[model samples]
Target: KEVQSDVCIVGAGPAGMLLGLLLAKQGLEVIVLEQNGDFHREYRGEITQPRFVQLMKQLNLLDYIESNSHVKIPEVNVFHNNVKIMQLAFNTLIDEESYCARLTQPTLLSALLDKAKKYPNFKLLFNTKVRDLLREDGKVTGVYAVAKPGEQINFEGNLNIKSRVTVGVDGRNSTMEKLGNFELELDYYDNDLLWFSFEKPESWDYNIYHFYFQKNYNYLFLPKLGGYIQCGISLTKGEYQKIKKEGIESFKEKILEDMPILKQHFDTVTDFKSFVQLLCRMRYIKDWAKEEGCMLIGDAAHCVTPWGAVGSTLAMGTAVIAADVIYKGFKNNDLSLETLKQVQSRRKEEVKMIQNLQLTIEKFLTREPIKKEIAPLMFSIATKMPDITNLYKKLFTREFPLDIDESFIFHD
Candidate 1:
């Protein structure tokens, strides 16, 4: 079977979904494809920075999104060896929409999906996996997907979707990156993070982001929507294997020594099966767009280390910019390489700055003998310096306002 649209998006993630909604609001026929049948992925991007909240406010969807379940993080506290070293209150940094919201990926995506469904031009396909790109005259035109067996939405076997432009918003292990043959500009692998969620301690402040630099490992604690706290234990590359070999009992003892407050909840953690390990790597594609009507956004364009938890925000920012660029391209009747290049041209600098910041933070997070000795001092100095606080503002908030057409934003 064959279908047609103005834009064919190759992922239903937050970035792809947002871009679909924005373009559809502009009266463009947009079709989004998702390989997964549902949005039940575990431990996905859940924290939204202040910049994201600001973006939502600009779109007039903040209130609607917040109507669903979420937790507001007002501040973040840093501890060195269990001693408080720095506190950054979001209110003091941003004037409006100061708190970072912990809205689960599923909730956020559903909200975007619901709003997008109102547009008659927007269509989303599930259980549809793109197998190849359709090209004409050396330019990408659309995609060929195969729907899963037993589920057919008016099509069987192969599905062909032809569009004026094709976007790859598929995540970190992006299939678009591989199919589009995007080159790598930067790939750094320095750390790994083991994540798990536990019941939030009674005395713990569920509204604060906590960072702990212990004698053995560095830890990040973020409040989950329910009465739970998600913890990420930082490890050097190839470190998780050794830790796992030490046995779960030994692992629990070591973490307990660092954060004794987790004693009760830690008891419920039986084995390594409860933990999810993420490769804390950063990657950037040399080019984000092709003259052939192909483009990459979000993690597909640049993958960031999970250091400051800004990956999702950066992806969504690019999505918004892509919508603006694509909308203009259609208006000008030009989907040439130069026009598609505008997406990265507008976003590369900010993305690079965040990447560099994450690299610096990763260096400080290392347990190397010399670096570990200076980590506390460096953090202490950061707390005292106004310049460091400004950097934090840059990491959590956008320096400039988004330049997008108001007509593209759906109202009410």
Candidate 2:
């Protein structure tokens, strides 16, 4: 089967979906393809930073999105040895839309999908995996994908989507990156995060983010909707293998020794199957645009560490920027490399700044003897410094409003 559109987006992630909706709103035909059968992402990028909330408000979609189930996190508290060391209330940093929203990936994607479906120009295909990029005259024209075997078939065996422009929003392990041969400019790997969630204790504060440095292990606790707290344990690369070799019982004992308050919730976690280990790394592509017809966005272009929980926000920012670039390209009737490169030229600085900040935070979160000894002092000093709020603002919020065509925004 062959289909055509103004823009063909590979990967129906938050980035792809947002771009599709924005372009569709501008009266452009947009098609989004997803390899997965459904939008059920487990323990993935679920937390949206303050910038994301602000972006949604700017687009007039915040109210509709918040109508779905979600948790608003206004503050984040850091602790060392179970003693609170620093607290940051986002409201003090941002004048408006000053809270992060914790909505599962599925909920967020569904909301975007629902809105996009209202546009006759938008189309999303599931269970469709891109096998190769369709190119002509040494320029990417679209993608050739195959539909996975399933009862709900959008298309038969092979499907080709031809478009004026092709976008690669596929995530960290991006097939678009591989197919396009985008070079890796930077790749830094240092830590891994082991994640698991249990029932939120009745006494726990459900509105604040928590970070703990206990027994030389750095742990992050984010409140989830439905009375649950998702926990992530930072580990040195290759450390999880050693932990698994030692046994789950011993591992549970170690965690209990550090945070005994979780004993009751940890009781049911009997095996390693309960945990999901995510390799936390930062990667940047050398060039986000390929000649005239192909471009990459989101984790496909730059992948941030899971430190500030800003991956989704950063990706969404890129999506909006891409939409702006594409909108202008179509208006000018030009989808050249010069126009596509604008996406990275406009976004590279902020992305690099966040990546560096995550690296600095990782240094403090390490288990090094000297660093761990002074981690609490550093955090305390940060709390007392007036400039620390500026730092928080830099990490959690954007310096300026996104520049985009007003006509593209849905004014309802």
Candidate 3:
């Protein structure tokens, strides 16, 4: 039997679920597929910026987010050793105009899934693995999937599904991109990262500290739903290798030396083996749609590094942009193979702009000469510059700034 949908969204993360919900609202039959039926994994970069928050509000995700935002990390503390250099609030600089929220990664996903379910035209297929994309005359038209039993099913079932369109919203390492030799330049950091969760009192949180550690290391500390924080140590490939081979005890101590406040709390630290992740990038294909109808979104399309805390917010932004493109394509009844390709091509400047920003941050924060001598000054400048803090606030709070229509550096 062939299953049918106007759009079959693969991956139920923020991108896919939000895409499904939007298209469904527009009277399209949307089906969302997820490899893991349960939403249990903690997400790094869970901090929402005002830019993303405003965009979410426009898309009507704010109300749902607010119901859970109070439990999230609304304040972030960036320390230079033990001294607090800068303090940032979700409503900083921007005020209530665009308030960012932080909740567990799953909370955002769950909200999108909940909205997707509310639409009668939307369906969810969990624990399904996409084996191959079915194409007609080199145009994607369908997909072959194998669904294994999980919290919802009993046995594996092979499903040949057809949709007006297909989307990939999986994270940074997207599988669809491999088919075409179209990968983005991960020119940000020549490094892989290790993530470990820390259980601490609510008084101590690290939700959105885009704090820099001189000499090839930066920290993106993200506080989660409860007392857990996602503390990621970004290091050069060489340093990571040394730390890994040198053994865990010494590695922990050496790593903590950069940020001694974390060391002071070491006694209360919950030891966790690190999670391995590469600083790779997401790619965009010029012709994302083929015969049957297929495309990619989220990190699969344009992944900026987590340097500026843009990954999750950018994922949500790009998903919306792609969804709008799809809707317009369907409106014009020109959902041709080239239509999706055009969409991807058009969104190029957006990805490039942000990706470049990622590289700039990586270079500025990681280079040896700068970190060794100017560590204090770097922290001092970030703390002192209203424009800089505003930049931080805008990462999630503000929009593309395309509306400004001017290249002003800072506010008067």
Candidate 4:
């Protein structure tokens, strides 16, 4: 049977779910397709920035997030070999409401899904894989999917959904972008990441995110929910080969050398294979939307390097932008190419600014001749300059500026 909707979104990730919720709440028939049976991922980025918090408030879901399991990360502590160089309180930069929250991604996503379920127009198809897009006269009209049973269900069912517009919210490696033939330009990085989770130390401060900087090798300790520490180590561009050759013992020592607090949980690490490798490359789509009704959002539109912890923030921001664009376009009954292009139009400059910032950091942060040798003096000067200070605060807070028009606002 063919399912009909006003909007059909691919990938029920942060972008997809939020867009679905907002649209459905506005009384638009929205369908979200997700391959995962459930939101139970163990290793994923969990940090939510101040801007994301503000968006939640606008959506009336901030209280739900506050009630869920989360750690309020108010301070960013920078250290060089256990010597604290900087401890900037986020609240001091902005207001007290601007701290980043370290909530597990699964918990956050589950809350979003639960709220989205309340909208009668919203439909979530889990364990469903989109095999192909349905098109007509060079226009993308819908998709063909097969629902599998396992984890969430084991029975097999086919789905053919028709919609006025189709969206791709799938993450960085989006299949829709590839399948839809969207042009891509990638910014390569000299570093990749190895993310691991461990039991948080009893002595660790829940409000602090500690970053240790060393040449070529660097790591950060992010406080996550339920007393868990999400730690990430940056490997030299394609440096995993050398690390694997040396074996797990040396890798453990390397991590210990920079952040020795993890020595207690050394045995828990067990082997080198326990960590997840994250490539440092970044990408963006030149044509975010096809002339035919298909459009991309979230990681499908822009993939940011992990340097600034801006991925999730940008994802949520982009999703909100997309929802607004669709809301107006559909209300006006104009799902034209120019109408769809508004998604990319609103985000380009800001996206470019942040991606460039991360690219510069990725290149120079560790492998560099350009080091802030007079760091104390630079820091002092920055604080004195309000513009510079605000810029720093915005970057640190992951609050990218956007010029959204009032038409996007949802009426009660």
Candidate 5:
């Protein structure tokens, strides 16, 4: 049998790793298990929002993200064809001019992983898969897991490991969520995306990220890691099939026609990789925990679409909250149903609200273009809407219901 820790967290993604670091900092023995041995990969949410920036500052991780990040966005650049649109700056939200650092998924994860390693209690178990949960007296104590991928060599399954709590920071398809039988409201669509990398120039007139508007398909261009660029073309599955059948040449031409800024640098675009698509999904489980033994966080608990780039930031933010609550519970010698329910209810609504907001934005932005003389006016309101811009900041935040007694939630 393997050793026991204060908490057994599954999934070594941003949330899992960061939560491990948070708990480890508080002097708790933590074990974070993951399916992958290597922590280098790209999935979603590289854009760091303003609220997230403040969160990092509070955690003292801002300098790490900024100095090492590849892209930094103070605001979004809205453009319509040859005419320029509004550059909605993020400073409008606060008094100071601050924006989210454009970070690469791999680079950001590496930073969090680096911090996790400094602590002695931070035990990271890579290439390990969590199988199921161990129940006692209708409450969760720990999880039953396996070490290898195949044979499915199960070892942690029978071991009577003890812990203050169990946390599920796994992916959207979280095994712990399933173990808790967490009820969720599912909102999903078979949406596809074509993302490719580009070679960035030495300098640009404007460094703001642009969410270029187009009929049927909209292009989102942002700075990527290593002075490179990562742009995405999102469309429905049926439309993508037609574009695919129409051939890459035809599709590229149409896409270039819509995105003028990208066309400006098309001559230098290299390493244009293949497309990766996914189903647009919004889901939230009602109960994030089962009794006291297990709980869920990040994409495992709730996952919104990528339209607003809220996933990673929210994951990191939630990790902070989850770690705090879990640690507090352990120190207080309690992991009761009421406390678990409180944790679930606190963050569930906020995450769901942002997800709903993203789905709405996708619906509004991706409508078929008018393609007429009023294209400019239609493009103006459609492209540069204040609500759309502000919503980005609002959605990418974590407002845990840390308002109990006002002292409980709002504290250092």
Candidate 6:
């Protein structure tokens, strides 16, 4: 049996889900294939920048985000030797809001799935792995997938789906991207990240992001909803195993060595399993669309560093573009390669700016802190100087992504 729809989306991340919801509300059939059994992924983005807030409000998804219980951080505090060096507030921006929100990525995506579910034309199939593509005379046509354990769509193991357009929101190791043979140019970063979470302390300021800097280490302390503080520490790329050779206690000691302030709660993370190393590599496909019937979004086309917390939000932005392009294609009944190139042209410029910013942070993180003083000096000037302050404001929060194209509008 074959499942058919106007659009077949290959991942259930925020990008795929948002695209699905938008199209479904417009009364188009959309089938979303998700390999995961559920939305409860172990790691997800914790910060949604203000530009994302503005987008969500326009889409009417802000209510869902607020209802999920998130922490709003108005400012980011930089510290040297546990002493505040600079604090940049988002509210300072002329048009942007005052804060960024911290919440688990799963919760936000789950909320998107729930809202998309309300549409009659949307169908999300979990635990369904897309094995390969179905093509006709070089133009892509559909997909082949197999249901894993806990199959929800149908009991039959094999399923075939055909559609006018196939979307890959399948993430970093995308099956769809590989199958399409898209050209990927990868830029490896020098530093890897180790993330660990602990209960939030009563004395800590919940609305300020605390970033610590030291000679050999840098870590971020972001407030998480549900009463926790997520600590993201940077390590030399490919150094986790050697570092672990010193054992978890040594690792904890290393963390303590930099920020002795955590000595009170550092003991909570006694096991190595609790901390996960985040090795990052940034890359973007040279081309995002293959002919008329295939398209890529989110990490499938471009992967950003975790340092900026722009992944999910950027994905949402691209999803909107994907839907618009596809809708126009459907309306005119021409899902041709040339027609889809509009998505690549418009979306690429915005994403490039973000990728460049992430690369800058990667360079900063990978190198030795020989010039840590420079950052403090920069931050100090940023806080006091009007020109430097707005620059900091734009870079820190939501303004960088050029406002969505004027012709592209979201209808509620």
Q: Write candidate 5's Cα lDDT for 318-407 as tens digits.
A: 777776676677768776767755665656666767767776565644434444334445657754565664554565443332332222
Instruction: Spell out the clash pairs found in candidate 1.
Output: none
Q: Where is model 6 poorest over a 10-residue stretch in terms of lDDT?
A: 401-410
lDDT of 6 by residue, 206-298 (tens): 655777766557778887666778788877777788878889787778778887767877767677888877777676988888665888888
Position 406, candidate 3: lDDT: 23
The lDDT of each candidate is 0.84, 0.84, 0.62, 0.74, 0.65, 0.74
What is the lDDT for 275 in model 6? Answer: 81
TM-score of 6: 0.90
For model 4, the local distance difference test gives: 0.74
Please write out the lDDT profile of model 1 over residues 1-412, one tens digit for every residue. 8888899999888899999889878888888888887876545767888888888887888888899999888888899899999888888877776778788899998888887787788888877788776586878888988876432221546888888699998888888887887888998998888888888877887876889989777889987777788899988899899998999999999999988988998779889999999887788998898557899989888879875668888899999999999888888998888899999999989999999988887878777888887887897887798587689888888867798987865566
Residue 195 lDDT in candidate 3: 75
Off by over 4 Å in 6: 96-98, 149-155, 268-271, 367-386, 393-412
Count clashing pairs, candidate 6: 1
Tens digits of per-residue lDDT, candidate 3, 1-412, equal 4787787777777767777777776777777777876776534446665666666556555666677654434555665554567676765556455544565567776766665576677777777777666666666666778887764310368887788677877666566666533444442336566776666545554444546453335666765556566667766656666666777677667667665556645655444344555554434444444334777767776666665456777777667766777777877998876777665565566666767656655553453664645755665685697567655643445544322112111112
Relative to the true structure, candidate 1 has a C-alpha RMSD (angstroms) of 1.7
Error of 2 at 254 (Å): 1.6
Q: Which of the predicted structures, 1 or 3, would earn the higher lDDT when compared with the native?
A: 1
The residue pairs that clash in candidate 4, if any, are 149-153, 149-154, 150-153, 150-154, 190-237
Candidates 2 and 6, the one with greater lDDT: 2
Candidate 2 segments whose C-alpha is farther than 4 A from its true place: 149-154
lDDT of 6: 0.74
Please state every model's RMSD to the true fold in angstroms: 1.7, 1.8, 5.9, 3.4, 4.7, 2.9
TM-scores, one per candidate: 0.96, 0.96, 0.81, 0.89, 0.83, 0.90
Model 5 residue runs over 4 Å out of place are 148-164, 201-206, 260-273, 368-379, 382-412
